[PDB]
Design a protein around this ligand. Structure first.
Ligand SMILES: O=C(O)c1cccc2c(-c3ccccc3)c(-c3ccccc3)[nH]c12
Length: 268
């Protein structure tokens, strides 16, 4: 059974993704996250399993940048997912809420790790579709970030997407205006929103009209090179956006700290 092999803890949270509980694997006391998703709330299926599970199995590996699915169960009206849980841990949203705008050295480290994680997914045929601070977990001890919540994701394809159920304020202007986007360039856009969030302590755009206007105003002191990378990711024309390679070869991205140095300087 399920409740046999996992000691269920307190509710960590709930929302569009379902309900997440803290847990521990009974055998070896491994900290786990127990995610309950209602069958009525799932729109994407087929291996018949939720897309999220397909996606999670596809990206599973020893690479600690993407969250690992440890196991999954089916129930009459729901699926239960047992995922890795770092400890101690904080999501990027809470982390930014506490500390405000991040020092460029830390934002570089964090951003680099998100890029490696997203490249990993794309390399495995997976498009996340909801990259944002709330979907990034920080292993506070190792200084390692984890991408979570593949519940809005899809198989990566080269043709247009006309469905979207990620986060509107991280969605590109081509989704807003036309309900059409392509996977890579839409991901780059959300990465630009994310970097801005990291260095300014909040997202650049709130309303649809700001997204489509795409004018970036900096509310905090941010280096010329970081502003350039940001504005590049946030190019209105999808084809004007950098590739993942171009982002990582950007002058601002050079001399990244290791996760363990990042934790030493900034987390410990
Ligand atoms: O959704 C996953 O794939 C997932 C995968 C792994 C972990 C999580 C945690 C999580 C977050 C903080 C601390 C511990 C677990 C959450 C979460 C999301 C919103 C509110 C509360 C929890 N979701 C996951």
């Amino acid at each position: 059974p399920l409740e046999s092999q996992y000691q269920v803890g307190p509710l960590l949270g709930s929302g569009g993704f379902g309900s997440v509980y803290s847990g521990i694997r009974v055998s070896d006391n491994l900290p786990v996250a127990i995610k309950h998703v209602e069958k009525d709330r799932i729109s994407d299926w087929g291996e018949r399993v939720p897309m999220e599970v397909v996606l999670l199995k596809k990206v599973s590996s020893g690479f600690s940048g993407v969250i690992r699915l440890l196991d999954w169960f089916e129930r009459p009206d729901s699926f239960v997912l047992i995922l890795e849980r770092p400890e101690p841990v904080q999501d990027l949203f809470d982390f930014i809420t506490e500390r405000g705008a991040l020092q460029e050295e830390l934002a570089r480290s964090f951003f680099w790790q998100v890029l490696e994680a997203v490249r990993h997914c794309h390399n495995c045929g997976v498009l996340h579709r909801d990259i944002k601070d709330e979907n990034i977990l920080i292993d506070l001890n190792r200084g390692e970030l984890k991408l979570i919540d593949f519940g809005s994701g899809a198989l990566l394809k080269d043709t247009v997407y006309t469905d979207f159920d990620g986060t509107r304020v991280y969605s590109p202007p081509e989704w807003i205006r036309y309900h059409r986007y392509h996977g890579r360039s839409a991901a780059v856009w959300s990465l630009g929103i994310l970097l801005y969030d990291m260095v300014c302590g909040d997202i650049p755009f709130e309303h649809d009209e700001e997204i489509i206007r795409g004018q970036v105003f900096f509310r905090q002191r941010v280096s010329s090179e970081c502003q350039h990378l940001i504005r590049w990711c946030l190019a209105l024309r999808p084809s004007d956006r950098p590739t993942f390679e171009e982002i990582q070869n950007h002058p601002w991205m050079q001399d990244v700290l290791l996760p363990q140095e990042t934790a030493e300087i900034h987390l410990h």
